[PDB]
Amino acid sequence: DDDLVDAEGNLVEAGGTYYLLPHIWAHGGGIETAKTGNEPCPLTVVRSPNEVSKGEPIRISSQFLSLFIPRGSLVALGFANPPSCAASPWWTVVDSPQGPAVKLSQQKLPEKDILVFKFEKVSHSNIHVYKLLYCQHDEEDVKCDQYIGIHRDRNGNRRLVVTEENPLELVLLKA
Ligand code: NI
DSSP states (O other), X not given: OOBOBOTTSSBOBTTOEEEEEOSSGGGOOOEEEEOOTTOSSOOEEEEOSOTTOOOOOEEEEESXXXXXXXXXXXXXXXXXXXXXXXXXXXXXXXXXXXXXXXXOOSSOOOHHHHOOEXXXXXXXXXXXXXXXXXXXXXXXXXXXXXXXEEEEOTXXXXXXXXXXXXXXXXXXXXX
């Protein structure tokens, strides 16, 4: 029943702000946004290519009421300071010709659409590192089997998307 642990070994505080950084420093910086396709503002969730950037502060909220996050629980992830055209700060997974992608929405969202993430601890590490799972509807329910990874588009944006191989890994650094 381990609760999530941050980069300094302390429990992640529900609703608190954290920087989602890669385990391997060489993989880039924190998570932020980019404007792609026909988007009116930055509604595409991406990983900063700047290794010194901590990216945007992210709020992690649980499906359960608690001061902490029970790692086996579903979580919603949102930017503490979302772009202007986003209706709310929460990330969602949207279908596309290229496959499911992590985005921000112009629409108000129902809990079932944002409470679709789950952190999965990686065993081979001295600190607490987590892969990020996406959990689609197992209909009245939901199931966490599909991982989140990176896809660099033609312009160099490192978009967070559902991937088959090579899931990203993260450490949660309290802002
Ligand atoms: Ni690793």
